[PDB]
Symmetry: C2
Subunit: 126 residues, 2 copies
């Protein structure tokens, strides 16, 4: 159901693990039907499951992307949480790192209803 | 005006410095006159500088508190950002620490319009 604080910590950690191995189908399953993705926050929300899958396959398709928590998950009692992490990727044909904070709201089924990924170019390191 | 990504990084870092030193009046002046605070996220919003001042005095006025960033500020291009930090307090007569992520939205005068502090008891260490 609506994840407890401890369950939010578990779910958000699981998200990171799935991104880190690059299981696109498993990531998309975490999302609710009405989910929205704002990534980076400030850009228009992505919605529709096909569209969210296309977003992740575009980002993770190369198969080389890595991700890890860089601090503990902060969770609420209303099914939300926030986490700091770092993504290792490739930009301009070179290895890079991107520092991100994700804010997630889960629904009463334990699926992601809204996600918001905070980062900009100030958070990229070549 | 509406802070750029770099300006958001600067403002949110300054906020941490003000909490760390406990300058309640300076903190309150970083907020818009009609700002809303949700701390912890999940609890009822408090509204306006009078209420926000009372909230920070309750948290910071008594026993002395320390605060520091535990990772970089993640900023957007629409005047928003998110940051991870740790608050050190004295509970009972013994030290405790609280891991928090704040999300802030600034207005076009450079003041905090809204903020959300993500944490729960899972983030406390006595």
């Amino acid at each position: 159901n609506l994840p407890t604080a401890q369950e939010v910590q578990g779910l958000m950690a699981r998200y990171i693990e799935l991104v880190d191995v690059g299981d696109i189908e498993a990531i998309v399953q975490m999302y609710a039907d009405d989910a929205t993705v704002e990534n980076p926050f400030g850009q228009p929300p992505i919605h529709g499951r096909e569209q969210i899958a296309a977003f992740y396959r575009q980002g993770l398709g190369g198969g080389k992307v890595r991700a890890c928590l860089t601090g503990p998950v902060r969770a609420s009692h209303n099914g939300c949480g926030a986490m700091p992490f770092r993504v290792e990727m490739v930009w301009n044909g070179q290895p890079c790192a991107l520092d991100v904070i994700d804010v997630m709201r889960f629904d009463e089924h334990g699926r992601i209803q809204t996600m918001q990924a905070y980062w900009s170019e100030v958070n990229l390191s070549v």
